[PDB]
């Protein structure tokens, strides 16, 4: 019973360059062969880095401190393919266009400790929004669901 989202063990090397084109510290996350996310060394903003990965491995990318979602070549997941004529493959990591609400939640979260969320004078519903922190595990479940609907 293997997850839909997982790397395949191709053993076929693929040279990749993670390029952080965001203002965040990026955490690369590798989905292992059982679909479990594994962290890899982070990238400061504006820096890039050579990676030895493999064909059909799966990667996603997050803000290292907050796990806010990031995009890679404009999508959620990145899969190395075989290198054509020595040329490495680029993973260009960017900010998505967050909604104004989610962006405000990021800023409030960065300024307020969770024990104090409910000591802010805002509508009651926003407490649960603030508490609904980004989470890799919930993202994978949502992406799996979305993919199955395409079938």
């Amino acid at each position: 019973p293997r997850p839909v989202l997982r790397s395949v063990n191709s053993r076929e090397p693929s040279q990749v360059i993670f390029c952080n084109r965001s203002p965040r510290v990026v955490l690369p996350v590798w989905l292992n062969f059982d679909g479990e996310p594994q962290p890899y060394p982070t990238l400061p903003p504006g820096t890039g880095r050579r990676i030895h990965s493999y064909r059909g491995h799966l990667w996603l990318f997050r803000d290292a401190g907050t796990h806010d979602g990031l995009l890679v070549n404009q999508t959620e997941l990145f899969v190395p393919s075989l290198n054509v004529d020595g040329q490495p493959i680029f993973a260009n990591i960017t900010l998505p266009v967050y909604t104004l609400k989610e962006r405000c939640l990021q800023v409030v979260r960065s300024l307020v400790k969770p024990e104090n969320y409910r000591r802010l004078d805002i509508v009651r519903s926003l407490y649960e929004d603030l508490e609904d922190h980004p989470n890799v595990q919930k993202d994978l479940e949502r992406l799996t669901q979305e993919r199955i609907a395409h079938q």
Binding site: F33, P41, G48, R49, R50, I51, H52, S53, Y54
Partner: peptide, 14 residues
């Protein structure tokens, strides 16, 4: 046997 990704130590992260 399984082969996971790795970062070469001598890779000058640019």
């Amino acid at each position: 046997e399984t082969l996971a990704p790795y970062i070469p130590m001598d890779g000058e992260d640019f």
